[PDB]
Amino acid sequence: NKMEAKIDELINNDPVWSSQNESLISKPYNHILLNLIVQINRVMNLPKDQLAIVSQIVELLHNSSLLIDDIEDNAPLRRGQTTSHLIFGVPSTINTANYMYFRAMQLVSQLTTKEPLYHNLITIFNEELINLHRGQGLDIYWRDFLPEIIPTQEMYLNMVMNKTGGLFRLTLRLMEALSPSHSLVPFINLLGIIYQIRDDYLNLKDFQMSFAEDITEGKLSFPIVHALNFTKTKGQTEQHNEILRILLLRTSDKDIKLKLIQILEFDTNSLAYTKNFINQLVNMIK
Amino acid sequence: KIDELINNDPVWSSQNESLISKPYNHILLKPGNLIVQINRVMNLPKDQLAIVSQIVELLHNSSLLIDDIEDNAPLRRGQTTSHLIFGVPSTINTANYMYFRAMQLVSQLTTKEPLYHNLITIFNEELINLHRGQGLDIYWRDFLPEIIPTQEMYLNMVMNKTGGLFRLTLRLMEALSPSSHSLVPFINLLGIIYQIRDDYLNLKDFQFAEDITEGKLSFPIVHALNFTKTKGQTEQHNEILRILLLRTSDKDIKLKLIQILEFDTNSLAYTKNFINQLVNMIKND
Numbered sequence: 021n022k023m024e025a026k027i028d029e030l031i032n033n034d035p036v037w038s039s040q041n042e043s044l045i046s047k048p049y050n051h052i053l054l055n056l057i058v059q060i061n062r063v064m065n066l067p068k069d070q071l072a073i074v075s076q077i078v079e080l081l082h083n084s085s086l087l088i089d090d091i092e093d094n095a096p097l098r099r100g101q102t103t104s105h106l107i108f109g110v111p112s113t114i115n116t117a118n119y120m121y122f123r124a125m126q127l128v129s130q131l132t133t134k135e136p137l138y139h140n141l142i143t144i145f146n147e148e149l150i151n152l153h154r155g156q157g158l159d160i161y162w163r164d165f166l167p168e169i170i171p172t173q174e175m176y177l178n179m180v181m182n183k184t185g186g187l188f189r190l191t192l193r194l195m196e197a198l199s200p201s202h203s204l205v206p207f208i209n210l211l212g213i214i215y216q217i218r219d220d221y222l223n224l225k226d227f228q229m230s231f232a233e234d235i236t237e238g239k240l241s242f243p244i245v246h247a248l249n250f251t252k253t254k255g256q257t258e259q260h261n262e263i264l265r266i267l268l269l270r271t272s273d274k275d276i277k278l279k280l281i282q283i284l285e286f287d288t289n290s291l292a293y294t295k296n297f298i299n300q301l302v303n304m305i306k
Numbered sequence: 307k308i309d310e311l312i313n314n315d316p317v318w319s320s321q322n323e324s325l326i327s328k329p330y331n332h333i334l335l336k337p338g339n340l341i342v343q344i345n346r347v348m349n350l351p352k353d354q355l356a357i358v359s360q361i362v363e364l365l366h367n368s369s370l371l372i373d374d375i376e377d378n379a380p381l382r383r384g385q386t387t388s389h390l391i392f393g394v395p396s397t398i399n400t401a402n403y404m405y406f407r408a409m410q411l412v413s414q415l416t417t418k419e420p421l422y423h424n425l426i427t428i429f430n431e432e433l434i435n436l437h438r439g440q441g442l443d444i445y446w447r448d449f450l451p452e453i454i455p456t457q458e459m460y461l462n463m464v465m466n467k468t469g470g471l472f473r474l475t476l477r478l479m480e481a482l483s484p485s486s487h488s489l490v491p492f493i494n495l496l497g498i499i500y501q502i503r504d505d506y507l508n509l510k511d512f513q514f515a516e517d518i519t520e521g522k523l524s525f526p527i528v529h530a531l532n533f534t535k536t537k538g539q540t541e542q543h544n545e546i547l548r549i550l551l552l553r554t555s556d557k558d559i560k561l562k563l564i565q566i567l568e569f570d571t572n573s574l575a576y577t578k579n580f581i582n583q584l585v586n587m588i589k590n591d
């Protein structure tokens with residue numbers, strides 16, 4: 021009866037969860053913790069306690085998405101430090117990241133009571149999280165099943181619209197919806213495309229000038245997509261195949277990585293094409 | 307084209323949708339209800355009942371895709387696990403994607419905003435509970451031997467972990483029911499019985515016992531370590547810890563652990579009996 025009584029207590033109450041338990045499971049997230057919203061707000065003009073919550077939400081989603089992305093990308097370093105999954109393990113990191121996505125979601129109701137507005141906010145959250153995963157899904161798929169699919173520039177841009185555009189739009193849309201009041205989404209869409217291609221570009225260019233981890237990862241980056249379609253079109257069979265073989269080695273060898281970068285530089289002219297593309301895009305936004 | 311591109315919703319084809327769905331479709335191939343029966347009392351319209359079932363189906367299967375990665379499991383329902391076929395990266399992303407697909411189905415449940423908020427909050431709260439309990443199960447396993455849970459700590463972990471999906475299904479139906487106590491306590495007790503039975507059987511069916519290989523603080527193991535600790539049985543206690551920490555696939559070593567659980571701590575019988583008393587709480591109500 022003494023036991024049957026503890027069981028009765030147990031099942032008749034909400035699950036027990038201590039502040040100690042919360043700290044233990046939060047380790048991966050606290051480790052990775054170690055200005056766009058402020059800017060955008062100069063136009064949206066949201067009261068400050070709402071702006072603070074939009075900020076917590078975007079911060080939880082961004083950091084959590086990086087913990088998962090680093091496991092998905094086999095990344096050794098993030099923000100200058102060892103990635104959380106190498107310290108705490110893949111199991112804990114995945115579970116904590118996923119836990120934080122749901123804590124982010126919980127914060128959405130601290131933004132308002134107005135049932136019409138609430139439904140819209142939750143839909144924005146749900147929509148863009150679906151987008152982010154669809155984009156991340158193709159990015160990973162192309163990479164891990166190469167050469168099953170060789171994306172074209174159009175396929176890559178559409179992937180970036182889902183992947184990169186997801187948190188940019190989530191941030192912008194939440195803020196527009198909370199604003200006492202045309203949409204800046206097309207501008208944020210462009211801003212995100214620039215950001216991603218620039219990221220892909222400098223990952224190689226910084227290396228060529230002096231880790232180019234995107235090559236080790238085997239990612240179908242913007243310059244890489246140009247190089248593979250360029251080589252196919254121009255009948256450069258051997259170069260097409262060598263770009264593929266190197267990507268598939270998942271190599272950390274610095275000379276093999278530089279070889280691939282110089283093929284992009286001298287053989288396909290993918291680096292110049294990409295630098296030009298980014299310039300044409302910045303010109304458009306300006 | 308850049309102007310077209312940025313002025314429209316992101317493009318996503320059904321072909322793209324099929325690509326990303328492979329890891330999930332894979333776990334769907336191997337079959338394996340309580341819901342239909344309970345509706346005899348909740349009486350949800352058939353269309354809402356289908357949606358609740360689909361929500362629970364997406365969450366359950368996706369959660370198992372993740373659990374198998376976290377547990378380094380080579381087989382699920384007698385078949386190779388999705389992460390060994392499509393890779394860990396795609397499997398995690400697909401599973402997480404389906405969590406959000408499940409979230410989206412919550413809106414097709416009702417138009418009434420008072421109700422809608424309540425359903426999202428139920429969905430949110432139980433996915434939080436699910437992760438809290440899974441995070442504690444994973445923590446004890448991976449930080450062993452830092453913390454050895456007591457039976458009370460284990461049952462609290464189970465209420466969050468296993469109870470999460472059971473309560474989610476039940477609370478969604480109770481919120482949606484057009485009919486006039488709650489079945490939560492019962493579903494909570496069913497969850498506990500379910501978990502302890504999964505832990506008990508993993509070993510008795512051997513007596514593969516993958517739980518040993520995983521190093522999980524299962525119900526029987528929790529009894530064994532707190533038993534050996536309580537009765538100053540130092541060497542037996544450490545031996546249990548040594549085998550769990552080995553992460554062994556060795557049939558002989560595992561049988562050696564089960565043997566200790568059968569004959570020294572008598573944890574298998576302690577567990578079988580615990581289950582019976584839980585079943586008696588219901589079969590005596």
Ligand SMILES: CCCCCCCCC(O)(P(=O)(O)O)P(=O)(O)O
Nearest residue numbers: 085086088089090093152153156219
């Ligand atoms: C569904 C989760 C999506 C998270 C997206 C995180 C992208 C991270 C990178 O932008 P980074 O590793 O250079 O920070 P990516 O290069 O696309 O892996």
Ligand SMILES: CCCCCCCCC(O)(P(=O)(O)O)P(=O)(O)O
Nearest residue numbers: 369370372373377436437440467504
């Ligand atoms: C946050 C997701 C939690 C999902 C928990 C799934 C538990 C699955 C098991 O019940 P199984 O591997 O025996 O099917 P567990 O023994 O606890 O890993």
Ligand SMILES: [Mg+2]
Nearest residue numbers: 089090093095
């Ligand atoms: Mg990455």
Ligand SMILES: [Mg+2]
Nearest residue numbers: 089092093159
């Ligand atoms: Mg990535």
Ligand SMILES: [Mg+2]
Nearest residue numbers: 219220223234
């Ligand atoms: Mg990058």
Ligand SMILES: [Mg+2]
Nearest residue numbers: 373374377379
């Ligand atoms: Mg498992």
Ligand SMILES: [Mg+2]
Nearest residue numbers: 373376377443
């Ligand atoms: Mg598990």
Ligand SMILES: [Mg+2]
Nearest residue numbers: 504505508517
């Ligand atoms: Mg199990």
